[PDB]
């Protein structure tokens, strides 16, 4: 342990201190966990089990009684502070919570969780990240080294170098909790093992165009950032490639009452730059603009002024000139003025015509278009039939939907073009051999007012969890075939995929939603009735909602890996439609501005081109998720989990419900549940002999003789050639009879 310098204590405690802390009072019979009202569970001692009534004295001094059917054991001291949760003698839902709690109490930041890695952000500076640790760590394998990000990073690097296959890193956590600095230290480690400054410089540009304020977090990120780190032929750092996925467009137009839009619009409305406002003719009052005022106007999340100036400076020191920046601001201002458009019915026709044109005139002036041509295109879209063009009619609702779809699409194209420009500027001329992917994705967010945007995020997270489960099953089968201990070949994917098949497959929730908006008289009541007709009782996951603590509304409830989630139907049908307008896209292509580059290509011997009207956000989401899965599945994945310890900034204190929610959304409970159905506890024959041979004082014959005298049932264990597998109950029985033996 002398190699790990003075940072070893946080990295790993010494054997002497461990042995000193091993001996402390603990009765396995009546010091078990007890349910609590303030938190999920508390540490307490039960006086006695007097039938269906118990008396537990918690650390707070309460004498509450609890039902006897929800009691469960507590970790013995000899297994406390375990590095890996997979080796825990009893797998219980809050046992992992309490182990992490008392490990952070002694400041063990990094903890193995089988295939997962748990890392809680410390609130004070630590010497673990000192580069002397990095330089001297090389030469240690994952198994021997105490848990840390460097262990899995070196394992992935070795796998890439020797196995000659791509490796990917998957991080999970809330933005602003240290994810950015964690990625910074990871890329610094990669550079040490051989463009960190460029990444840090370009990060605020992506952060400002992709983050928005939500109820849970003031700096919540939405898009699925993904960075590919390339290497040279001789295993040396070569270049970095960055991509973006699953950017949400619904946030641009529809916002929840207590949530903001993207930081872009608020940052533009900063008064410290007066030239932009007057040159764009922007109304300085955010209240007037329709697209912004619907949500919460402003919060004290981050002071926007110097952030905007920092982004402008980062753009200025970047490769392109200021004219492109000005084009960016003016295009954003044009997106802003799309909400001022108004339309009214005609004389004796169902057709719609504009009333005001000043906002249309100014928007056309900014885009370099003609106001009359743009209005004619919006009101009368030209379409091609056979060999002849004909004009189509539009009412008020359709033109409003088209106006919203155009604003969403142009924003998407701008973001994608910006990402391409950043990737080109970052690009070096080094050859790109095998790469190491880094994936960042939004977590399994839970609210009391879940909607379509949260539904998409939950479905994506569930797909990712299913992928992780399949990977862990493959790893377990590989270990089983390595050890020759092979049983229970049933796959662990279909159990979770049962819920997936009711979302993406035909006759699923998403498919019915997509079909319903096409029916021209659809309403929310009809949509709910169809969902109930097609899924209530017929499926094993769809079920009635629950009304708890006066929740505002609930229409239907699903079951996921994270528990019961209910969603609100109201408002889903209106915002699912994304009908684009072809003639407006042609007019953009005919424009005199850079905007034509963004809309350069947009929409016989076999064709399936979906029409402009037949365009739903859900379909694009499914397509993007599928194209992402066709890319991520090609690489060997690794998982990193980040957990916030408390809601407050104060170090040391914890919020138990918060840690429960983090564990539930991170899927650790699912991992331990999948591990518990098999044989999670695996001990070597030599260790078992040096620990448990004393029980019957006197290697296959000896082990068999020893186990035959312990009344161990045949089905409770697996007898191998290198390791012997035991069930959780066997370890507890052995611990108890060792206790009575001593």
């Amino acid at each position: 342990m002398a190699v790990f310098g003075a940072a070893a204590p946080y990295l790993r405690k010494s054997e002497k201190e461990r042995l000193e802390a091993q001996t402390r009072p603990f009765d396995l019979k009546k010091d078990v966990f007890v349910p609590d009202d303030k938190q999920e569970f508390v540490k307490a001692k039960i006086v006695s089990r007097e039938g269906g009534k118990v008396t537990a004295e918690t650390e707070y001094g309460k004498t509450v009684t609890v039902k006897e059917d929800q009691v469960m054991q507590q970790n013995p001291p000899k297994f406390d502070k375990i590095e890996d949760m997979a080796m825990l003698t009893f797998l219980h839902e809050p046992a992992v919570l309490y182990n992490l709690k008392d490990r952070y109490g002694s400041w063990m930041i990094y903890t193995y969780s089988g295939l997962f890695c748990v890392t809680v952000n410390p609130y004070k500076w630590l010497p673990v990240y000192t580069p002397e640790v990095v330089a001297a760590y090389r030469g240690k394998k994952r198994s021997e080294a105490p848990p840390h990000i460097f262990s899995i990073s070196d394992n992935a690097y070795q796998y890439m170098l020797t196995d000659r296959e791509n490796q990917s890193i998957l991080i999970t956590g809330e933005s602003g909790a240290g994810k950015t600095v964690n990625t910074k230290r990871v890329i610094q480690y990669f550079a040490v093992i051989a463009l960190e400054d460029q990444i840090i410089q370009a990060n605020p540009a992506l952060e400002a165009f992709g983050n928005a304020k939500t109820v849970r977090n003031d700096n919540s990120s939405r898009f699925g950032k993904f960075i590919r780190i390339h290497f040279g032929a001789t295993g040396k750092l070569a270049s970095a490639d960055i991509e973006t996925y699953l950017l949400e467009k619904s946030r641009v137009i529809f916002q929840l009452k207590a949530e903001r839009d993207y930081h872009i619009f608020y940052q533009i409305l900063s008064n410290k730059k007066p030239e932009l406002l007057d040159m764009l003719l922007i109304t300085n009052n955010p209240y007037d603009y329709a697209f912004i005022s619907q949500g919460e106007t402003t919060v004290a999340s981050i002071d926007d002024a110097e952030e905007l100036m920092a982004t402008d400076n980062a753009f200025d020191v970047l490769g392109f000139t200021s004219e492109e920046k000005n084009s960016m601001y003016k295009l954003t201002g044009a997106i802003m003025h799309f909400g001022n458009m108004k339309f009214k019915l005609k004389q004796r026709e169902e057709q719609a015509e504009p009333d005001g044109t000043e906002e249309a005139d100014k928007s056309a002036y900014l885009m370099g278009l003609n106001s009359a041509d743009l209005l004619k295109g919006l009101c009368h879209p030209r379409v091609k039939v056979g060999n002849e063009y004909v004009t189509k009619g539009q009412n008020v609702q359709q033109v409003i939907y088209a106006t919203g779809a155009l604003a969403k699409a142009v924003y998407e194209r701008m973001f994608n073009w910006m990402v391409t420009r950043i990737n080109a500027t970052l690009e070096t001329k080094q050859p790109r051999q095998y790469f190491i992917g880094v994936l960042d994705i939004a977590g399994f967010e839970i609210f009391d007012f879940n909607s379509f945007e949260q539904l998409c995020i939950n479905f994506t997270n569930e797909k990712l969890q299913q992928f992780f489960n399949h990977h862990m099953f493959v790893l377990e089968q590989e270990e089983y075939k390595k050890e020759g201990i092979e049983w229970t070949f049933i796959d662990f994917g279909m159990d979770l995929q049962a819920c997936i098949d009711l979302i993406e497959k035909p006759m699923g929730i998403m498919s019915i939603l997509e079909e319903e908006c096409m029916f021209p008289k659809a309403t929310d009541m009809t949509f709910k009735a169809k969902l109930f007709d097609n899924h209530l009782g017929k499926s094993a996951n769809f079920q009635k909602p629950r009304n708890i603590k006066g929740k505002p509304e609930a229409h239907f409830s699903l079951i996921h890996y994270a528990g019961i989630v209910d969603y609100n139907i109201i408002g889903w049908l209106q915002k699912n439609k994304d009908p684009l307008n072809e003639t407006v896209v042609g007019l953009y292509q005919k424009s005199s501005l850079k905007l034509l580059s963004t809309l350069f290509a947009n929409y016989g011997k076999g064709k399936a081109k979906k029409g402009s009207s037949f365009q739903t956000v859900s379909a694009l989401h499914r397509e993007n998720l599928n194209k992402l899965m066709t890319n991520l599945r090609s690489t060997h994945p690794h998982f990193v989990r980040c957990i916030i310890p408390n809601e407050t900034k104060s170090p040391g204190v914890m919020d138990n419900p918060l840690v429960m929610h983090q564990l539930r959304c991170n899927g650790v409970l699912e991992g331990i549940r999948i591990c518990r159905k098999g044989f999670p506890n695996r001990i070597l024959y030599g260790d078992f002999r040096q620990r448990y041979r004393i029980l019957n004082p006197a290697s296959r014959k000896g082990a068999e003789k020893l186990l035959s005298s312990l009344d161990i049932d045949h089905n409770q264990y697996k007898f191998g050639h290198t390791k012997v597998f035991f069930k959780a109950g066997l370890l507890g029985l052995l611990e108890e009879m060792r206790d009575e033996r001593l």
Partner: protein, 183 residues
């Protein structure tokens, strides 16, 4: 896979894939035959010009409409029309594309029977369906009620629909159409 929507109509055949905003191929439903002898040797004129090609050679052909008022009267010409539409216009194999067909109300049952038999046997389409013109017209109009007046080149009819429920006893069919106007 994707579905195929073919509308035989009357005087104009229009077809295209499902989920499209407009038919890809629109051309008159005309089969023409050369009525003269032909003296040049080597060119090898074909014995039947079908579709929009017959419009180009209009001056040396006898244009015959395979259907008079909705009812198909010259079946062989209709196999020719359908083959042209499926191969030279859409360039797709109907072996893996379900086909939706449109058919006017109050027509002989033998017409629908022969249509389905031809589709299933000659072209081996995996699946097919026949629908009424008025219901589709009401679909495209963004409505669920109202009486629709469908007047093509073959026949004019009204079908009243209320709340997605039709009124079969109130369907009126009139054979006056565009062809009679031309005459």
């Amino acid at each position: 896979t994707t579905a195929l929507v073919c509308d035989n109509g009357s005087g104009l055949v229009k077809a295209g894939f499902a989920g499209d905003d407009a038919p890809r191929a629109v051309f008159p439903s005309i089969v023409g035959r050369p009525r003269h002898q032909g003296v040049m040797v080597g060119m090898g004129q074909k014995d039947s010009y079908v579709g929009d090609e017959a419009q180009s050679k209009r001056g040396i052909l006898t244009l015959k409409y395979p259907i008079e008022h909705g009812i198909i009267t010259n079946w062989d010409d209709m196999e020719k029309i359908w083959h042209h539409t499926f191969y030279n216009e859409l360039r797709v194999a109907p072996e893996e594309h379900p086909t939706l067909l449109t058919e006017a109300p109050l027509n002989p049952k033998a017409n629908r029977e022969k249509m389905t038999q031809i589709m299933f046997e000659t072209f081996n389409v995996p699946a097919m369906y026949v629908a009424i013109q008025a219901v589709l017209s009401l679909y495209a109009s963004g409505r669920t009620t109202g009486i629709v007046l469908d007047s093509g080149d073959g026949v004019t009819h009204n079908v009243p629909i209320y709340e997605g429920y039709a009124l079969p006893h109130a369907i009126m069919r009139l054979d006056l159409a565009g062809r009679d106007l031309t005459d």
